[PDB]
Amino acid sequence: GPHMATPKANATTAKPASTTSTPVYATLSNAVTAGAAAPQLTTLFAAVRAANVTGALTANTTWTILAPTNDAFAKRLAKLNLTADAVLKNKDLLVKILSYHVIPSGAVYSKALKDNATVATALKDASVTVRLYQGKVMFKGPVNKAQVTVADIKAGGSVIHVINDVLLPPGVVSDAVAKQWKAEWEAMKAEKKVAPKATTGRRFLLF
Ligand SMILES: CC1=C(/C=C/C(C)=C/C=C/C(C)=C/C=C/C=C(C)/C=C/C=C(C)/C=C/C2=C(C)C(=O)[C@@H](O)CC2(C)C)C(C)(C)C[C@H](O)C1=O
Secondary structure, three states: OOOOOOOOOOOOOOOOOOOOOOOOOOOHHHHHHHHHHOHHHHHHHHHHHHOOOHHHOOOOOOOEEEOOOHHHHHHHHHHHOOOHHHHHHOHHHHHHHHHHHEEOOOOOOOOOOOOOOEEEOOOOOOEEEEEEEOOEEEEEOOOOOEEEEEEEEOOOOOEEEEEOOOOOOOOOOOHHHHHHHHHHHHOOOOOOOOOOOOOOOOOOOOO
16 A cells, blocks of 8 residues: 655754852753852863863753762872873863763662663773762772762752762773782782773863
8 A cells, every 4th residue: 555654853952041059950051050159079070161061961851961070070180190281271181081071871879870880981991880989879880989078969850969079981091000000909919901902191282
């Protein structure tokens, strides 16, 4: 018989903006404005904003982002012995790192939260392990681990958690730095062979 059909098409865009002060947010826009007003996420917002990724934050969008306090960046930065400006100007690294900070896996649930339960980030070949301790959600990766200090941030459409430290993907950490942590396991003397991929430390001041 008569078997004929047609294609489909649909799309929309919006750029809302409203600065308010309340315990519960209405949408992503509300969440961002909240963190932006507080210096607690100065560094983070500094990268997230400059990165121009905020555009992704829309309504009816379920996502899990990690907003680590300033101390976090200052910690990992001091330990890695690197410059922030060099990265701030480097869009490549900006999104490269921020990508991991985000979790497209979706709003995690306490019921699903487990010790072995792993989470997949936006960055390919990047995942973290879930850990339960003191009724808190702890994260652990291949290099450097952090713990969620304040979570359950009332948001609209999406959800964000506050961490004390920040985590970085494989390859971003230098050999020397990464070695400092590897030494802990090296002491055992029983693992697989691993080599570097890229180096870092290219920045000079000029007036
Ligand atoms: C862009 C983009 C993509 C990628 C987008 C990324 C990677 C976005 C990253 C966003 C972040 C990281 C947002 C963080 C957004 C973070 C936000 C909104 C954080 C809010 C934090 C708050 C309100 C914290 C509050 C408190 C604090 C901090 C305390 O310390 C307590 O004491 C008090 C209390 C009140 C609990 C894509 C790949 C999908 C491709 C798309 O085509 C596209 O276009």
